[PDB]
Amino acid sequence: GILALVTDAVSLPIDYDMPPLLEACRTVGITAEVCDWEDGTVDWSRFEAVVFRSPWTWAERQAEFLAFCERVSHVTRLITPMPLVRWALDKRYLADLAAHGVPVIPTTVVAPGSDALAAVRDFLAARPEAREFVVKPTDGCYSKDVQRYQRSLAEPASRHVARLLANGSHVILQPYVESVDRHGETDLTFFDGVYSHAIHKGAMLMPDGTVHVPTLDFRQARDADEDQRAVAAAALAASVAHLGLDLPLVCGRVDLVRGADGSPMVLEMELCEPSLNLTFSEDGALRFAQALAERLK
Ligand SMILES: Nc1ncnc2c1ncn2[C@@H]1O[C@H](COP(=O)(O)OP(=O)(O)O)[C@@H](O)[C@H]1O
Ligand SMILES: [Mg+2]
Numbered sequence: 001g002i003l004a005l006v007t008d009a010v011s012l013p014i015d016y017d018m019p020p021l022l023e024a025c026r027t028v029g030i031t032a033e034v035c036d037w038e039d040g041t042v043d044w045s046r047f048e049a050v051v052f053r054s055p056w057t058w059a060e061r062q063a064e065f066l067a068f069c070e071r072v073s074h075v076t077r078l079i080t081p082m083p084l085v086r087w088a089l090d091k092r093y094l095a096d097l098a099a100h101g102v103p104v105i106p107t108t109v110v111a112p113g114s115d116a117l118a119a120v121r122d123f124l125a126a127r128p129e130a131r132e133f134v135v136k137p138t139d140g141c142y143s144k145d146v147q148r149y150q151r152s153l154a155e156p157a158s159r160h161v162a163r164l165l166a167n168g169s170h171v172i173l174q175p176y177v178e179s180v181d182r183h184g185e186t187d188l189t190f191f192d193g194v195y196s197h198a199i200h201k202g203a204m205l206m207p208d209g210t211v212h213v214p215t216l217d218f219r220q221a222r223d224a225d226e227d228q229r230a231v232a233a234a235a236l237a238a239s240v241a242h243l244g245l246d247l248p249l250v251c252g253r254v255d256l257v258r259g260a261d262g263s264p265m266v267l268e269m270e271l272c273e274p275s276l277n278l279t280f281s282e283d284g285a286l287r288f289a290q291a292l293a294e295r296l297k
Protein backbone atom coordinates (compact mmCIF):
# COMPACT_ATOMS: atom_id res chain seq x y z
CA GLY A 1 0.00 0.00 0.00
CA ILE A 2 2.71 2.45 -1.01
CA LEU A 3 1.37 6.02 -1.27
CA ALA A 4 2.58 8.40 -3.97
CA LEU A 5 2.90 12.06 -2.94
CA VAL A 6 3.01 14.09 -6.16
CA THR A 7 5.25 17.11 -6.61
CA ASP A 8 7.71 18.42 -9.21
CA ALA A 9 11.36 19.48 -9.03
CA VAL A 10 10.68 23.21 -9.19
CA SER A 11 8.03 23.10 -6.47
CA LEU A 12 9.49 20.61 -4.00
CA PRO A 13 11.75 23.29 -2.41
CA ILE A 14 8.78 25.42 -1.38
CA ASP A 15 6.58 22.56 -0.17
CA TYR A 16 7.11 23.16 3.54
CA ASP A 17 4.51 20.45 4.18
CA MET A 18 6.37 17.48 2.67
CA PRO A 19 8.92 16.96 5.50
CA PRO A 20 6.32 16.92 8.31
CA LEU A 21 3.81 14.99 6.17
CA LEU A 22 6.33 12.21 5.56
CA GLU A 23 7.00 11.84 9.29
CA ALA A 24 3.27 11.71 10.01
CA CYS A 25 2.87 9.07 7.30
CA ARG A 26 5.61 7.13 9.04
CA THR A 27 3.66 7.41 12.29
CA VAL A 28 0.45 6.01 10.78
CA GLY A 29 2.33 3.18 9.11
CA ILE A 30 1.97 4.27 5.49
CA THR A 31 4.90 4.03 3.09
CA ALA A 32 5.02 7.16 0.98
CA GLU A 33 7.17 8.02 -2.02
CA VAL A 34 7.64 11.56 -3.33
CA CYS A 35 7.04 11.56 -7.10
CA ASP A 36 7.52 14.19 -9.79
CA TRP A 37 4.55 14.16 -12.16
CA GLU A 38 6.91 14.84 -15.09
CA ASP A 39 9.22 11.92 -14.27
CA GLY A 40 8.62 9.40 -17.04
CA THR A 41 10.42 6.67 -15.08
CA VAL A 42 7.57 6.34 -12.57
CA ASP A 43 5.35 3.28 -12.72
CA TRP A 44 2.16 4.73 -11.25
CA SER A 45 0.57 1.28 -11.35
CA ARG A 46 2.77 0.38 -8.36
CA PHE A 47 0.88 2.64 -5.94
CA GLU A 48 -2.19 1.83 -3.86
CA ALA A 49 -3.22 5.45 -4.21
CA VAL A 50 -1.91 8.87 -5.18
CA VAL A 51 -2.12 12.26 -3.46
CA PHE A 52 -1.38 15.55 -5.22
CA ARG A 53 0.73 17.60 -2.86
CA SER A 54 2.82 20.15 -4.71
CA PRO A 55 2.94 19.70 -8.52
CA TRP A 56 2.67 23.47 -8.53
CA THR A 57 4.10 24.05 -11.98
CA TRP A 58 0.71 22.83 -13.21
CA ALA A 59 -0.12 26.54 -13.28
CA GLU A 60 2.34 26.82 -16.19
CA ARG A 61 0.95 23.82 -18.06
CA GLN A 62 -2.58 23.15 -16.87
CA ALA A 63 -3.72 20.93 -19.73
CA GLU A 64 -0.56 18.82 -19.31
CA PHE A 65 -1.17 18.23 -15.61
CA LEU A 66 -4.86 17.47 -16.10
CA ALA A 67 -3.86 14.89 -18.74
CA PHE A 68 -1.36 13.41 -16.30
CA CYS A 69 -4.00 13.07 -13.60
CA GLU A 70 -6.41 11.51 -16.10
CA ARG A 71 -3.85 8.89 -17.18
CA VAL A 72 -2.93 8.09 -13.58
CA SER A 73 -6.58 7.46 -12.64
CA HIS A 74 -6.63 4.49 -15.00
CA VAL A 75 -3.73 2.72 -13.35
CA THR A 76 -4.27 3.51 -9.66
CA ARG A 77 -6.64 5.18 -7.20
CA LEU A 78 -6.63 8.96 -6.79
CA ILE A 79 -7.51 10.19 -3.28
CA THR A 80 -9.01 13.22 -5.02
CA PRO A 81 -10.95 11.67 -7.96
CA MET A 82 -10.95 13.39 -11.36
CA PRO A 83 -14.26 15.24 -11.00
CA LEU A 84 -12.80 16.92 -7.89
CA VAL A 85 -9.48 17.58 -9.61
CA ARG A 86 -10.90 19.31 -12.70
CA TRP A 87 -13.27 21.34 -10.52
CA ALA A 88 -10.68 22.30 -7.88
CA LEU A 89 -8.10 23.51 -10.39
CA ASP A 90 -10.36 26.22 -11.81
CA LYS A 91 -11.48 29.22 -9.75
CA ARG A 92 -14.82 29.06 -11.54
CA TYR A 93 -15.80 26.98 -8.51
CA LEU A 94 -16.48 30.34 -6.80
CA ALA A 95 -19.79 30.55 -8.69
CA ASP A 96 -20.82 27.10 -7.49
CA LEU A 97 -19.99 28.21 -3.95
CA ALA A 98 -22.11 31.33 -4.42
CA ALA A 99 -25.03 29.18 -5.60
CA HIS A 100 -24.84 27.26 -2.31
CA GLY A 101 -25.13 30.37 -0.17
CA VAL A 102 -21.39 30.54 0.56
CA PRO A 103 -20.23 34.19 0.68
CA VAL A 104 -17.59 34.85 -1.97
CA ILE A 105 -15.76 37.83 -3.42
CA PRO A 106 -17.91 39.31 -6.21
CA THR A 107 -16.48 37.35 -9.15
CA THR A 108 -16.85 37.85 -12.92
CA VAL A 109 -15.65 35.10 -15.29
CA VAL A 110 -14.37 36.04 -18.77
CA ALA A 111 -14.31 33.12 -21.22
CA PRO A 112 -11.86 32.55 -24.10
CA GLY A 113 -13.23 34.15 -27.24
CA SER A 114 -14.60 37.14 -25.35
CA ASP A 115 -13.75 40.74 -26.17
CA ALA A 116 -11.12 41.52 -23.52
CA LEU A 117 -11.64 45.29 -23.29
CA ALA A 118 -15.44 45.15 -23.45
CA ALA A 119 -15.41 42.54 -20.68
CA VAL A 120 -13.34 44.83 -18.44
CA ARG A 121 -15.55 47.83 -19.15
CA ASP A 122 -18.82 46.00 -18.52
CA PHE A 123 -17.28 44.79 -15.25
CA LEU A 124 -16.36 48.30 -14.09
CA ALA A 125 -19.77 49.54 -15.22
CA ALA A 126 -21.50 46.98 -13.02
CA ARG A 127 -19.26 47.91 -10.10
CA PRO A 128 -18.85 51.73 -10.21
CA GLU A 129 -17.97 51.54 -6.51
CA ALA A 130 -14.81 49.47 -7.02
CA ARG A 131 -11.79 51.78 -6.79
CA GLU A 132 -9.48 48.96 -7.80
CA PHE A 133 -9.97 45.52 -9.31
CA VAL A 134 -7.93 42.37 -9.81
CA VAL A 135 -7.22 40.28 -12.88
CA LYS A 136 -6.31 36.63 -12.54
CA PRO A 137 -6.52 33.34 -14.47
CA THR A 138 -9.04 30.83 -13.12
CA ASP A 139 -6.38 28.15 -13.43
CA GLY A 140 -3.39 29.33 -11.42
CA CYS A 141 -1.70 29.46 -8.01
CA TYR A 142 1.12 31.08 -6.06
CA SER A 143 0.09 34.54 -7.32
CA LYS A 144 0.66 33.56 -10.97
CA ASP A 145 -0.44 36.25 -13.45
CA VAL A 146 -2.42 37.99 -10.72
CA GLN A 147 -2.49 41.79 -10.82
CA ARG A 148 -4.03 44.85 -9.16
CA TYR A 149 -5.39 47.82 -11.13
CA GLN A 150 -6.95 51.23 -10.46
CA ARG A 151 -10.25 51.41 -12.37
CA SER A 152 -8.77 53.97 -14.76
CA LEU A 153 -6.42 51.26 -16.04
CA ALA A 154 -9.03 49.25 -17.94
CA GLU A 155 -7.14 49.19 -21.25
CA PRO A 156 -3.89 47.90 -19.71
CA ALA A 157 -5.80 45.33 -17.69
CA SER A 158 -7.73 44.30 -20.81
CA ARG A 159 -4.33 43.54 -22.33
CA HIS A 160 -3.51 41.43 -19.30
CA VAL A 161 -6.87 39.73 -19.78
CA ALA A 162 -6.28 39.18 -23.48
CA ARG A 163 -2.90 37.58 -22.79
CA LEU A 164 -4.62 35.02 -20.56
CA LEU A 165 -7.46 34.25 -22.95
CA ALA A 166 -4.89 33.73 -25.70
CA ASN A 167 -3.41 30.89 -23.67
CA GLY A 168 -6.94 29.52 -23.53
CA SER A 169 -7.51 30.21 -19.83
CA HIS A 170 -10.70 31.67 -18.36
CA VAL A 171 -10.12 34.98 -16.57
CA ILE A 172 -11.67 36.19 -13.35
CA LEU A 173 -12.33 39.85 -12.60
CA GLN A 174 -12.92 40.85 -8.98
CA PRO A 175 -13.15 44.15 -7.16
CA TYR A 176 -10.13 44.73 -4.93
CA VAL A 177 -11.12 43.92 -1.33
CA GLU A 178 -9.79 46.93 0.60
CA SER A 179 -9.38 45.17 3.95
CA VAL A 180 -6.67 42.94 2.49
CA ASP A 181 -4.18 45.83 2.47
CA ARG A 182 -4.19 46.03 6.26
CA HIS A 183 -5.59 42.67 7.40
CA GLY A 184 -4.32 40.34 4.70
CA GLU A 185 -6.28 37.09 4.64
CA THR A 186 -6.89 34.03 6.81
CA ASP A 187 -6.25 30.53 5.45
CA LEU A 188 -8.02 27.69 7.30
CA THR A 189 -7.00 24.05 6.96
CA PHE A 190 -9.49 21.21 7.36
CA PHE A 191 -9.13 17.44 7.61
CA ASP A 192 -12.16 15.24 6.90
CA GLY A 193 -14.54 18.14 7.42
CA VAL A 194 -12.90 19.14 10.71
CA TYR A 195 -11.12 22.41 11.40
CA SER A 196 -7.46 21.89 12.24
CA HIS A 197 -5.68 25.23 12.12
CA ALA A 198 -5.15 28.47 10.24
CA ILE A 199 -2.60 31.14 9.43
CA HIS A 200 -2.56 34.77 8.48
CA LYS A 201 -1.06 35.59 5.09
CA GLY A 202 -0.06 39.15 4.23
CA ALA A 203 -1.35 41.00 1.18
CA MET A 204 0.30 39.93 -2.09
CA LEU A 205 -0.64 42.76 -4.44
CA MET A 206 1.21 45.98 -3.55
CA PRO A 207 -0.27 49.40 -4.41
CA ASP A 208 2.92 50.11 -6.39
CA GLY A 209 2.37 47.20 -8.79
CA THR A 210 4.53 44.70 -6.94
CA VAL A 211 3.14 41.17 -6.77
CA HIS A 212 4.45 39.05 -3.91
CA VAL A 213 4.58 35.30 -3.57
CA PRO A 214 3.41 33.71 -0.23
CA THR A 215 6.79 32.78 1.25
CA LEU A 216 7.23 31.77 4.92
CA ASP A 217 7.87 35.34 6.07
CA PHE A 218 4.41 36.20 4.75
CA ARG A 219 2.79 33.62 7.04
CA GLN A 220 2.09 33.20 10.75
CA ALA A 221 -0.06 30.96 12.95
CA ARG A 222 -3.58 32.29 13.46
CA ASP A 223 -6.64 31.13 15.34
CA ALA A 224 -9.68 31.44 13.07
CA ASP A 225 -12.80 32.72 14.81
CA GLU A 226 -16.21 31.04 14.76
CA ASP A 227 -17.48 33.01 11.77
CA GLN A 228 -14.45 32.21 9.66
CA ARG A 229 -14.58 28.51 10.52
CA ALA A 230 -18.32 28.61 9.91
CA VAL A 231 -17.84 30.03 6.41
CA ALA A 232 -14.93 27.72 5.60
CA ALA A 233 -16.98 24.67 6.62
CA ALA A 234 -19.88 25.84 4.45
CA ALA A 235 -17.57 26.16 1.46
CA LEU A 236 -16.38 22.58 2.03
CA ALA A 237 -19.90 21.22 2.49
CA ALA A 238 -20.97 23.02 -0.69
CA SER A 239 -18.10 21.30 -2.50
CA VAL A 240 -19.05 17.90 -1.14
CA ALA A 241 -22.68 18.42 -2.18
CA HIS A 242 -21.91 19.90 -5.59
CA LEU A 243 -19.65 17.02 -6.64
CA GLY A 244 -21.72 14.34 -4.94
CA LEU A 245 -18.78 13.25 -2.81
CA ASP A 246 -19.46 10.25 -0.57
CA LEU A 247 -16.75 11.26 1.88
CA PRO A 248 -15.53 14.58 3.28
CA LEU A 249 -12.48 16.13 1.67
CA VAL A 250 -9.39 14.44 3.15
CA CYS A 251 -7.93 17.93 3.33
CA GLY A 252 -8.62 21.40 2.05
CA ARG A 253 -7.78 25.03 2.63
CA VAL A 254 -10.30 27.85 2.49
CA ASP A 255 -8.90 31.37 2.21
CA LEU A 256 -11.02 34.17 3.68
CA VAL A 257 -10.98 37.95 3.42
CA ARG A 258 -12.92 40.60 5.37
CA GLY A 259 -15.71 42.42 3.58
CA ALA A 260 -16.62 46.01 4.44
CA ASP A 261 -19.46 44.33 6.34
CA GLY A 262 -16.71 42.81 8.46
CA SER A 263 -18.02 39.31 7.79
CA PRO A 264 -15.76 36.79 6.01
CA MET A 265 -15.92 35.78 2.35
CA VAL A 266 -14.06 33.15 0.35
CA LEU A 267 -11.10 34.46 -1.66
CA GLU A 268 -10.09 31.07 -3.01
CA MET A 269 -10.24 27.43 -1.94
CA GLU A 270 -7.78 24.58 -2.58
CA LEU A 271 -8.93 20.98 -2.48
CA CYS A 272 -6.63 19.24 -4.94
CA GLU A 273 -3.03 20.17 -4.11
CA PRO A 274 -3.18 22.78 -1.30
CA SER A 275 -0.38 24.19 0.75
CA LEU A 276 -1.72 23.18 4.17
CA ASN A 277 0.63 25.06 6.55
CA LEU A 278 1.26 21.90 8.56
CA THR A 279 4.32 23.41 10.24
CA PHE A 280 2.19 26.17 11.78
CA SER A 281 0.07 23.74 13.82
CA GLU A 282 1.20 21.26 16.46
CA ASP A 283 -0.69 18.25 15.10
CA GLY A 284 -1.91 19.19 11.63
CA ALA A 285 0.36 16.70 9.90
CA LEU A 286 -0.80 13.84 12.12
CA ARG A 287 -4.43 14.68 11.40
CA PHE A 288 -3.63 14.60 7.70
CA ALA A 289 -1.83 11.25 7.85
CA GLN A 290 -4.66 9.80 9.94
CA ALA A 291 -7.30 10.99 7.49
CA LEU A 292 -5.22 9.38 4.73
CA ALA A 293 -4.89 6.21 6.82
CA GLU A 294 -8.68 5.96 6.93
CA ARG A 295 -8.94 6.14 3.12
CA LEU A 296 -6.49 3.28 2.71
CA LYS A 297 -8.28 0.87 5.06
N1 LIG B 1 -10.20 40.46 -5.11
C1 LIG B 1 -9.06 40.59 -4.34
N2 LIG B 1 -8.93 41.61 -3.47
C2 LIG B 1 -7.83 41.78 -2.73
N3 LIG B 1 -6.79 40.95 -2.82
C3 LIG B 1 -6.82 39.90 -3.66
C4 LIG B 1 -7.98 39.67 -4.47
N4 LIG B 1 -7.68 38.70 -5.35
C5 LIG B 1 -6.45 38.32 -5.16
N5 LIG B 1 -5.87 39.03 -4.13
C6 LIG B 1 -4.47 38.93 -3.65
O1 LIG B 1 -3.64 38.16 -4.58
C7 LIG B 1 -3.22 36.93 -3.95
C8 LIG B 1 -3.41 35.75 -4.91
O2 LIG B 1 -4.76 35.77 -5.39
P1 LIG B 1 -5.40 34.31 -5.26
O3 LIG B 1 -6.85 34.43 -5.38
O4 LIG B 1 -5.08 33.64 -3.85
O5 LIG B 1 -4.86 33.41 -6.52
P2 LIG B 1 -3.69 32.34 -6.13
O6 LIG B 1 -4.27 30.93 -6.29
O7 LIG B 1 -2.50 32.51 -7.10
O8 LIG B 1 -3.15 32.54 -4.62
C9 LIG B 1 -4.05 36.75 -2.69
O9 LIG B 1 -3.35 36.04 -1.68
C10 LIG B 1 -4.39 38.19 -2.29
O10 LIG B 1 -3.39 38.75 -1.43
MG1 LIG C 1 -4.31 29.20 -4.77
Ligand SMILES: [Mg+2]
Binds near residue numbers: 142255268
Ligand atom coordinates in the same frame (compact mmCIF):
# COMPACT_ATOMS: atom_id res chain seq x y z
MG1 LIG D 1 -4.01 32.36 -2.43
